[PDB]
Swiss-Prot record:
Residues 2-108 form the PH domain. Coiled coil: none annotated. It is linked to Developmental and epileptic encephalopathy 31A: An autosomal dominant epileptic encephalopathy, a heterogeneous group of severe early-onset epilepsies characterized by refractory seizures, neurodevelopmental impairment, and poor prognosis. Development is normal prior to seizure onset, after which cognitive and motor delays become apparent. Phosphorylated by CDK5 leading to synaptic vesicle endocytosis (SVE) activation. The lineage of its organism: Eukaryota, Metazoa, Chordata, Craniata, Vertebrata. Catalyzes the hydrolysis of GTP and utilizes this energy to mediate vesicle scission and participates in many forms of endocytosis, such as clathrin-mediated endocytosis or synaptic vesicle endocytosis as well as rapid endocytosis (RE). Associates to the membrane, through lipid binding, and self-assembles into rings and stacks of interconnected rings through oligomerization to form a helical polymer around the vesicle membrane leading to constriction of invaginated coated pits around their necks. Homodimer; homodimerization is mediated by the dynamin-type G domain which promotes assembly-stimulated GTPase activity. Homo-tetramer formed from two dimers in the absence of lipid. Oligomerizes into a helical polymer that self-assembles around the vesicle membrane, when associated to the menbrane through lipid binding. The chain holds residues 518 to 630 of 864 of the full protein. The dynamin-type G mediates homodimerization and plays a role in self-assembly. This is Dynamin-1. Belongs to the TRAFAC class dynamin-like GTPase superfamily. Dynamin/Fzo/YdjA family. It is found in: Cell membrane; Membrane, Clathrin-coated pit; Cytoplasmic vesicle; Presynapse. It comes from Homo sapiens (Human).
Length: 113
């Protein structure tokens, strides 16, 4: 119910078949993490349950300046659609760190990297 945070994040590993890496507007609550095309909320890319979401430091990553972390379904292959893991990136390390605390509150805890 309570909104924990609203803020932009880049989904770095969105397929060829979905435009590629685009920025999406995230809304996290104690029950769901939903992502939209933008802050107007006219869209809905999807609403994924926070249940069974965990967070891992995804092993160095691409050869970029991005700091990577990811949400992954602990009990199955894909996290949503045909994805394996949903990669989230920030231009700065502090951005990644503040968002980790917001996920903590919603019940997505770290480890299993």
């Amino acid at each position: 119910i309570l909104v924990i945070r609203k803020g932009w994040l880049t989904i770095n590993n969105i397929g060829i078949m979905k435009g590629g890496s685009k920025e999406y507007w995230f809304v996290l609550t104690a029950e769901n993490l939903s992502w939209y095309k933008d802050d107007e909320e006219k869209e809905k890319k999807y609403m994924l349950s926070v249940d069974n979401l965990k967070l891992r430091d995804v092993e160095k990553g691409f050869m970029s300046s991005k700091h990577i972390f990811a949400l992954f379904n602990t009990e199955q292959r894909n996290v949503y659609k045909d994805y394996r893991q949903l990669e989230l990136a920030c231009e700065t390390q502090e951005e990644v760190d503040s968002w980790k605390a917001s996920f903590l509150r919603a019940g997505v805890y770290p480890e299993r990297v």
